[PDB]
């Protein structure tokens, strides 16, 4: 669908993710290729398959975010499954087809919600005519001057201009309705009333299929957790089982959805792993073939942290400012304030367990717990969060390790 | 929906839970944020997600209560699931999606019950017109004077006024009815019919969805029992598995309910643990990221006990009084009688197994077993529960340990 | 159905698979026999059963391809199942009948898609008459002159000729429609309606059955992994169990599909194995009897690699060129550039894990990652991939072993 | 149904099976007994139950073939299940009722297909009248001389005689049809069209039940694999479990089929085993009682092999000749040619694993792989397969043992 060049894709992706430029270009090549395909002929359109990607890197450094924004950027159906979620089906559990079902149930919960956007002006234009008709019951067979029913639009325009807020005047209209009711009701009873007339069935639900098959993006987290490890063997075939089970999906097959028959042949797959215990080559042969693209993602640095805090559109910091503005409070972060928030986050990840950028949300959130509570009783104030404040609120916590495993 | 400042929320929570102010603050900021979000713009509303909380504290000190009163204070759908439930799914178990289904089913049994409220008034106000139309069959063509019909409001009035109690008189009215059933019964049958035709079936079930999606509150109890421990390895896999399974729910996804397709991106999660064996930093990194808020709850003291006994609204001590009054017995606890009831509870908890505040219920019940039975034959009396009475009924039991593990 | 002599089949297969002539001959005799049978008499048609084949050979050398191109050459339904899948059924697993169900479901999604072909022409040829009948409403009672109607084929012609592109103009036509939707849309909506009423629903699904029963091709991958081994005993039971489970399918039986009752007596089975651990004589005797044909496939050499790279139809090298042309870039591989690409692939397979021809895809993709991204900004250019370019992009990676287990 | 004497049964069975005369008479007594029963009175018809048989012998020597031909000879519903197929249901798997279901789904896939045979002359006689009616639209209310609509049968007989191949003349006829179409279509659209009018529901599906209950034949392979063995105990009750599970079926009970309620009381059961590890007496008491008939089958000899190659009706050799005739090639086997084919088969079974007569299909098939391929380019030739040819094609293979475990 998108006609964006890889470079334009990476650009757009730079608005949400800091660094990880390589994974960006990989994911960008994949998107542009879907365009490149449709510009081909009959034959080559069956042969050319998605160049699936294997993202390699430590926790919370942007693997899923990149895939999520890529998906969101091409208005593509997106699903994220954890590979181990199937390592238990040998005793019972979700079958792997579920992935294509869900990427269909949400690929529908998408086309449906995005049919309320398109059909939101129809019920409040060619449908608000319901109330204005029981306010000024149109002439006994309107005359006909293509401006005759545009004439009132005086007697009419008055009932519309006044319908800019003034209501609660109970009347009635029309299984159509008939029943006597109120406008804060016989108006809202129309909101949905006249809208289901425009949205059909065998096209809306028929298109979800079209979407999944053409633009579906499946993100398989922890693919490395289903590779063979040298600690046992019984659980290995269990793991390797999930690999074989996943095989039909990325090799090309047909799954049964309660919305139709979906073909996975062109669904793009972004697998993901840390690969500390296993290596991509421990993945079965058939899967390595279907995972042509390998891209590495680096661990985040303190500078990466500072940037993540503020650069992304609607960055945690920006959102915080917004939310406090809700309470009528003007919150503001100084450069050194951020530098320390990032510093704290790095400290805890290094002194305890590393969870990547995640750590920033908890640190940032703990730092603000006080303003967040008192916000309402501070309205009309300019609160500045600077190095000082940051230090007074986080030092003790970060400093105390056992406490960090609980509170930070 | 609520417009209560965090501080206002805590106050309303103070009416039910003693102490644990920090946990109140935490849970209150969470609520307030759901409001703060709707005040944002198109973009920032997709970005800002719930600030899930992880409550850390010993058993029976107010964790579930706090959360339950939070949801009950926001008329939000609330589900409490025991995390370990899904451990055995590795062999065969309830899917984790079940959590969002059940959230939905009780969220339906909710919007549906609270539908019987609005349709309980106008449900039997138009239900009268039915029985009256056969006690004073209206004129052949009413005369539009908007008062020429409210005329009986003479003959009519008498039947309505005599229908304020003196009914039970057979009749016949109207798939409508056309049967000949008593008015006590026509009245009853009418409660239904008129009520139902007054309920929008579609919007009903479509609202339960809106609820779960917008105000859903999931309480995952003992999440700490699905963290990794140094005792074995096989369990840890399934243990951690349940974390991976829960992951999509708290990260954002779509589940299939039999009442529709529900999205979890904005359900608020309150996880809970004791954390004596594991530490919050033992949860998988993707989960720690989704639990930005950490709050500890302190163990209850004896003062806490004394207060929990009488201070809350509908406190168990107040409940007992109410229940005894039902029997015509005036029950009164003295300050020392309560100081001693609490004292006893603390004693069994230190003496044997510490079950937190739960212990007050059993001690209090053992103490009243006597009155509770005789109540009826004690009507019109002023029984007083003081230190003497208390000590006479609990001391022997409390002092005897083995007997305590059975009887209290 | 096909009337191709075995030799003709092999030729058509030579267009996609390099070498492995023996396996081609084997699979070609199988097809030819399905014809040879229909030439027999009533009796001899029940007797003669498919000559199932057992392909023996290392990974990624052309086994599945051969079989896939065989079915695709006979427009036959084709399913590929990994035999070990059913191992875990001993604890809980997909039934083996699932193979014939899935064969049927993709065989349905097949006869159904190939229905959209014939109903894509006359589907929108009679779909025009619809839009035209509202641009030139036909006379009140056409005049049977079989040309007096093709008269407009004047006024009519103009709208048809102006409907060859210049449409998008609103209209209204006819559960039919009776709505007022744009012609770009009436046209679209018409594609469906006229197409559907043109599809015999019963014979559709009844044909998928006919297909599976008459031309079904089941490919049971890694059957050798369900043979008995001298390592344990418990698994062997389930292992062999899967053989007993498969037995009725390849011996002749009836399975229940949700689209009807399918019989397997004439599905052709192509089993596959590496057979390093077990030997074909390790399959249970009832199964060896049903696999009358045994053919070995040799490992691929570097010449094989070089050829596989450019020789097939829509070979990956040709595909890349096509894809790059989509970006306006002329890509050309020199003889030595290809000799070196193949060389590299063979090197990683000897150096690390030998994944057969699959390796060409990853090496080729790593090699083009650079061009692939820049393509757009390289439009109108003649990029040439020669030994130099190749060596500059692969040598370092290929030479570094550990890096190969990740990146290639 | 059949009125054949046991001797006539064995005779008819001799047309397909070589040797194994005893198993023949056993299976023949069983069939004749079903006739003997219906010739009895009310009482004795409930009491007399099938004399179930236990066939004892080595692989591929005629156990199933005998049972298959017996079934086929009495047009009885036949099902073959592998006993171990249920030894896994203790962890999950097919329930034993499935056997009676399948023996119903195929016992239906039988009555249905054999309703297309009976109703194949009805649509091409009293239904081809559809096309001849739109070719010569019958008189306005045919007169009536019992030879009046037999009169045309000139104008009529001409349209029928010419309808012996000449068509493709699009017309139309009549949810009946109406729609304009073609004869290679409006003729075929009639083939099934007028035929569903003769076949009813509650008799066709009602009779399948009647069949299974009266003539059902269940063949339970490897019954010995579910007897107790002295290697373990846990899996024993698992095996012995399948015995108990099978008990209701051969003792008399009711199973639920989606076609009706089937009674197994008169289904004939032919169990089968090798009994090398266990003995029939290791079968549980109740099952030995229900398996009154015990018959042994001998291993096949080289002479048995020579005879099997050529005597049976539609013997592999005969079929081969037929199939090559399809290619216009005259294949012919000399007595010594066969003697050697059999010899080779015996050799391999003795030098490696014995798989009985199965071995002949693989040897025979390998021997012909060349003629089978070149058949089309040899048309009009008399190819003789004699001792020489046989030797040149099989010697090397049979001689090389490891190769035989793969290729033969
Ligand atoms: N490079 C990055 N740029 C911006 N945000 C990031 C980055 N890395 C991690 N994050 C933040 O941390 C969280 C971690 O999840 P995610 O980014 O999906 O990575 P992973 O898939 O490795 O866990 C995300 O919510 C995201 O907002
Ligand atoms: N701080 C408290 N204030 C009031 N009641 C409490 C408190 N702590 C415990 N309780 C009582 O004890 C029971 C213990 O359950 P709960 O409060 O859910 O805590 P927990 O989740 O730790 O078990 C509740 O029913 C509640 O009525
Ligand atoms: N002989 C060959 N000719 C052409 N392509 C081949 C050949 N061998 C392997 N390949 C390529 O390598 C991949 C390996 O899969 P496949 O051919 O199914 O063999 P296998 O079943 O042994 O894994 C295929 O996609 C195919 O395009
Ligand atoms: N005595 C025999 N006469 C004719 N064919 C036989 C004989 N024994 C085995 N066969 C052939 O070998 C195959 C082996 O299967 P089957 O005869 O069912 O025996 P079993 O049940 O012991 O495996 C059959 O397809 C059959 O054609």
Curated annotation (Swiss-Prot), chains A, B, C, D:
One of its GO terms (molecular function) is ATP hydrolysis activity. Keywords: ATP-binding, Chaperone, Cytoplasm, Nucleotide-binding, Stress response. Gene3D superfamilies: 1.10.8.60, DNA helicase RuvA subunit, C-terminal domain, P-loop containing nucleotide triphosphate hydrolases. ATP binds at residues 18, 60-65, 221, 286, 358. It comes from the Bacteria. It is found in: Cytoplasm. GO terms for cellular component: cytosol; HslUV protease complex; membrane. Changing residue 95 to W: Partial loss of protease activity. Changing residue 286 to Q: Complete loss of activity. Disulfide bonds: none annotated. Optimum temperature is 55 degrees Celsius. Induction: By heat shock. GO terms for biological process: cellular response to heat; protein denaturation; protein unfolding; proteolysis; proteolysis involved in protein catabolic process; response to heat. Changing residue 92 to G: Partial loss of protease activity. InterPro entries: AAA+_ATPase, ATP-dep_Clp_protease_ClpX, ATPase_AAA_core, Clp_ATPase_C, HslU, P-loop_NTPase. Changing residue 358 to A: Complete loss of activity. HAMAP family: HslU (MF_00249). Belongs to the ClpX chaperone family. HslU subfamily. A double ring-shaped homohexamer of HslV is capped on each side by a ring-shaped HslU homohexamer. The assembly of the HslU/HslV complex is dependent on binding of ATP. ATPase subunit of a proteasome-like degradation complex; this subunit has chaperone activity. The binding of ATP and its subsequent hydrolysis by HslU are essential for unfolding of protein substrates subsequently hydrolyzed by HslV. HslU recognizes the N-terminal part of its protein substrates and unfolds these before they are guided to HslV for hydrolysis. This is ATP-dependent protease ATPase subunit HslU. The gene is hslU.
């Amino acid at each position: 669908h998108s006609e964006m060049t890889p470079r334009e894709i990476v650009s757009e992706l730079d608005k949400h993710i800091i660094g990880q430029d390589n994974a960006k270009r990989s994911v960008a090549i994949a998107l542009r290729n879907r365009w490149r395909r449709m510009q081909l002929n009959e034959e080559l359109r069956h042969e050319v398959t998605p160049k699936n990607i294997l993202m390699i890197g430590p926790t919370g450094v942007g693997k899923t975010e990149i895939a999520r924004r890529l998906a969101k950027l091409a208005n593509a159906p997106f699903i994220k499954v954890e590979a181990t979620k199937f390592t238990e089906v040998g005793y019972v559990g979700k079958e792997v087809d579920s992935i294509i079902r869900d990427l269909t149930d949400a690929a529908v919960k998408m086309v449906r919600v995005q049919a309320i956007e398109k059909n939101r002006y129809r019920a409040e234009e060619l449908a608000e005519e319901r109330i204005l008709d029981v306010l000024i019951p149109p002439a006994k067979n309107n005359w006909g001057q293509t401006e005759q029913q545009q004439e009132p639009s005086a007697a009419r325009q008055a009932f519309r201009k006044k319908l800019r807020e003034g209501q609660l005047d109970d009347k009635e209209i029309e299984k159509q309705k008939a029943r006597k009711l109120k406008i804060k009701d016989a108006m809202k009873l129309l909101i949905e009333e006249e809208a289901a007339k425009l949205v059909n069935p065998e096209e809306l639900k028929q298109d979800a299929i079209d979407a999944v098959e053409q633009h579906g993006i499946v993100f398989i987290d922890e693919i490395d957790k289903i590779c063979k490890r040298g600690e046992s063997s019984g659980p290995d075939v269990s793991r390797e089982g999930v690999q074989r089970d996943l095989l039909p999906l990325v090799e090309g097959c047909t799954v049964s959805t309660k919305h139709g028959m979906v073909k996975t042949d062109h669904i793009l797959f972004i697998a993901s792993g840390a690969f500390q215990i296993a290596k991509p080559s421990d993945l079965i042969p058939e899967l390595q073939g279907r995972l042509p693209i390998r891209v590495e993602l680096q661990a985040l640095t303190t500078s990466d942290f500072e940037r993540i805090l503020t650069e992304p559109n609607a960055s945690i910091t920006v959102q915080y400012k917004a939310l406090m503005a809700t309470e009528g409070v003007n919150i503001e972060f100084t450069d050194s304030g951020i530098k320390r928030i990032a510093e704290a986050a790095w400290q805890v990840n290094e002194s305890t367990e590393n969870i990547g950028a995640r750590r920033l949300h908890t640190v940032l959130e703990r730092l603000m717990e006080e303003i967040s509570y008192d916000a309402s009783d501070l309205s009309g104030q300019n609160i500045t969060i600077d190095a000082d404040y940051v230090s007074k609120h986080l030092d003790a916590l970060v400093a105390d390790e056992d406490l960090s495993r609980f509170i930070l």
